[PDB]
Write a protein that binds this DNA or RNA. Structure first.
Ligand SMILES: [Mg+2]
Ligand SMILES: [Mg+2]
Ligand code: NA
Ligand code: NA
Lengths: 257, 250
DNA sequence: TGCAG
């Protein structure tokens, strides 16, 4: 098939923890997010730390998307699906029994470019000290990826809060599942998604750089595998209010679907 | 000595075993450290009756008149009192509140605050609401005041993060001083045997938040230590919490 | 008034 039919069949996603818990300039920052969505027109958006006012705003502005949320109050995750590109089939939420932070796993099954996709997001248990709970949640996520319908491509994207050796400590990713940043070459340029030296939204006594935001991919077991195409960190511009959209950078990523 | 000093301590007044001896222990610490300000939580009337009898160098403010409550003690020779107030927590189920005393310390205004935020792991909702109030008050305190909040926050991992973090200009003293491991945990069931429990739990419930005045150069914490981790004659610790001693460069 | 690594 020709170049343009191929470029049109490519899936695009954005994953972003929007820091809805930071009340400062929140309306301006939601406007910022919307400007990025208009720029990148992603097929799927995976969001974390939404709060009701924020998602209400998005639903009023981003009317070309269908919305699903991980909760109706507090703070929660969301999946947005571009209606002209992605056909919604069904959704569900899987609970994390031992979370103290209302965390869970939000799943949407869809059709895209003639293929079934299983789209997942979570905001895994926060803070270094919560390595144990986070790890448990990671296991659930990975199990759900392994077990997804054999004919589906699985894409999890979210704020994993994972740090050094936590994945290695569960034996690494299972066969058939890759971390997209790893698969694209472990590039330093687009590695850290939370960087308190570079991002001035929070004042912090000690700076750190972490790769909290991650994308895991599993191809269909019954079809040829798909590769990621390209990834970039986004949101590294300040808004008119003099702050960034979030204390995280977003990930923009395409796949050769 | 130009350095301001404070002690903050949840005295566990709800534990009545050896309470008199334990209040004596606390008084021994006050006599040694002679802090300018003492922030206390979980006082009960008997306990405070004792302290007021003994610590005559201090002016007392109490957060309630019965049940259990907080207190602020001011060293009369070092601190001049201006005014006090209590901010209520409308949805507390445990009579928690925010006790505030405004004072001057060699001419510099201090806005002193204490609270015992809603207790128990599962009360994170109410606790976080209360934390919001506290932080907002710290934010709104008079520009010419140094603000010191010290108290039993009952705070967990991410509860501060899940509120948006501390506001600009406001620091956690333990963090500011380098997250030193030896003055980290203030409630430690392994190291403290006052509570009979089977499990090990180690938490940083007791915290100090600091904001400078704009009318003066930034205040930095200088030295912090945990106190009370030695048994009294009665064979028990002063409290199930360790106390915090802290000095400031003003 | 149930950790952290
Ligand atoms: Mg956050
Ligand atoms: Mg207690
Ligand atoms: Na490609
Ligand atoms: Na000192």
């Amino acid at each position: 098939t020709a170049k343009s039919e191929v470029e049109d069949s490519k899936l695009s996603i954005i994953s972003w923890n929007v820091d809805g818990l930071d009340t400062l300039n929140l309306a301006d920052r939601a406007r910022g997010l919307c400007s990025y969505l208009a720029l990148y027109t992603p097929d799927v958006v995976f969001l974390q730390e939404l709060i009701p006012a924020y998602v209400q705003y998005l639903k009023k502005r981003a009317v070309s998307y269908l919305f699903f949320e991980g909760s109706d109050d507090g703070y929660f995750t969301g999946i947005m699906l571009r209606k002209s590109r992605v056909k919604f089939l069904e959704s569900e939420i899987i609970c994390f029994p031992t979370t103290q932070m209302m965390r869970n796993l939000l799943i949407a099954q869809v059709t895209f470019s003639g293929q079934k996709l299983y789209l997942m997001t979570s905001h895994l248990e926060s803070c270094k000290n919560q390595s144990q709970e986070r790890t448990k949640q990671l296991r659930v996520v990975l199990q759900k990826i392994k077990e997804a319908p054999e004919d589906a491509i699985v894409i999890f994207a979210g704020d994993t809060n994972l740090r050094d050796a936590e994945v290695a400590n569960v034996g690494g990713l299972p066969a058939g599942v890759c971390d997209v940043w790893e698969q694209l070459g472990k590039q330093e340029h687009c590695r850290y998604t939370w960087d308190t030296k570079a991002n001035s939204n929070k004042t912090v006594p000690y700076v750190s750089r972490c790769r909290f935001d991650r994308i895991f991919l599993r191809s269909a077991k019954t079809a040829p595998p798909v590769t990621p195409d390209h990834m970039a960190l986004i949101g590294m511009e300040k808004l008119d209010c003099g702050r960034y959209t979030s204390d995280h950078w977003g990930i923009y990523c395409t796949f050769n679907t």
